[PDB]
């Protein structure tokens, strides 16, 4: 049973839009952003950055 | 031949008028909202990230 599903929309930083998405066509598997005055990081599948 | 003359002519009643249309604008007033944002955040502190 789901006891909770926190869904959020994080921005993609400038250094990822240009260096990753626009340059290589890829996106990082980690979302590092600022939410509620706090540095929050999320790892996809709780795995390493890819 | 006995042909008719000019018609009688319209009798006009000079006056003043105010023309009302159906009211469609909503009734507007000033209200005040008192509330409290209660934000409870659950943070998991990893080795190097939160």
Coordinates of C-alpha atoms in Angstrom, one line a residue:
Chain A
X1 CA 0.0 0.0 0.0
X2 CA 1.1 3.5 -0.8
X3 CA 1.3 5.5 2.4
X4 CA 2.3 8.7 0.6
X5 CA 3.6 9.9 -2.8
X6 CA 5.5 13.2 -2.7
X7 CA 5.5 14.5 -6.3
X8 CA 7.6 17.7 -7.0
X9 CA 8.8 19.5 -10.1
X10 CA 12.5 20.5 -9.9
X11 CA 14.2 22.9 -12.3
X12 CA 17.1 21.8 -14.5
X13 CA 20.0 24.1 -13.8
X14 CA 21.7 26.3 -16.4
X15 CA 24.9 24.2 -16.3
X16 CA 22.8 21.1 -17.1
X17 CA 20.6 22.6 -19.8
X18 CA 23.6 23.8 -21.8
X19 CA 26.3 21.2 -20.9
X20 CA 24.0 18.1 -20.9
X21 CA 20.7 18.6 -22.7
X22 CA 21.8 21.1 -25.4
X23 CA 25.3 19.7 -25.9
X24 CA 25.0 15.9 -25.5
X25 CA 21.2 15.5 -25.6
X26 CA 21.3 13.6 -22.3
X27 CA 20.0 14.6 -18.8
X28 CA 21.4 13.8 -15.4
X29 CA 19.7 11.1 -13.3
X30 CA 20.0 13.2 -10.2
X31 CA 17.9 16.3 -9.4
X32 CA 19.7 18.7 -7.1
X33 CA 17.7 21.8 -6.4
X34 CA 16.5 24.2 -3.7
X35 CA 13.1 23.6 -2.2
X36 CA 11.6 25.2 1.0
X37 CA 15.0 27.0 1.6
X38 CA 16.9 23.7 1.6
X39 CA 19.3 21.9 -0.8
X40 CA 17.5 18.8 -1.7
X41 CA 18.9 16.0 -4.0
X42 CA 17.1 13.1 -5.5
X43 CA 18.7 10.0 -7.1
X44 CA 16.8 8.1 -9.7
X45 CA 16.2 4.5 -8.6
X46 CA 18.3 5.4 -5.5
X47 CA 21.3 4.6 -7.8
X48 CA 24.5 6.4 -8.8
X49 CA 24.4 9.5 -11.1
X50 CA 24.0 8.6 -14.8
Chain B
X1 CA -61.0 66.7 -58.4
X2 CA -61.0 67.0 -54.6
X3 CA -57.6 65.6 -53.6
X4 CA -56.4 65.2 -50.0
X5 CA -54.0 67.6 -48.3
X6 CA -51.0 67.0 -46.1
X7 CA -51.4 64.4 -43.3
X8 CA -52.0 65.4 -39.8
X9 CA -48.4 65.1 -38.6
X10 CA -46.9 63.3 -35.6
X11 CA -47.4 64.8 -32.2
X12 CA -44.2 64.6 -30.2
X13 CA -44.0 64.7 -26.4
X14 CA -40.7 66.3 -25.5
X15 CA -39.2 64.9 -22.3
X16 CA -36.2 63.3 -20.6
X17 CA -35.3 59.7 -20.3
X18 CA -33.0 57.2 -18.5
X19 CA -32.6 53.8 -20.2
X20 CA -31.7 50.9 -18.0
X21 CA -30.3 47.6 -19.3
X22 CA -30.0 44.2 -17.5
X23 CA -27.3 44.1 -14.9
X24 CA -24.6 41.5 -15.6
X25 CA -21.7 42.8 -13.4
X26 CA -21.2 40.8 -10.2
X27 CA -21.7 42.5 -6.9
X28 CA -18.1 43.2 -5.6
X29 CA -16.9 43.9 -2.1
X30 CA -13.8 43.8 0.1
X31 CA -13.1 40.6 2.1
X32 CA -10.1 39.6 4.3
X33 CA -8.7 36.1 4.4
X34 CA -7.0 34.9 7.6
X35 CA -5.2 31.6 7.4
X36 CA -2.0 29.7 8.3
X37 CA 0.3 27.7 6.0
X38 CA 1.3 24.7 8.0
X39 CA 4.2 23.0 6.2
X40 CA 5.6 19.8 7.7
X41 CA 8.6 18.5 5.8
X42 CA 10.1 15.0 6.2
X43 CA 13.8 15.0 5.4
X44 CA 16.1 12.0 5.1
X45 CA 19.7 12.9 5.8
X46 CA 22.0 10.7 3.8
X47 CA 25.8 10.4 4.0
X48 CA 26.5 13.5 1.8
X49 CA 23.1 14.8 0.8
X50 CA 19.7 15.6 2.2

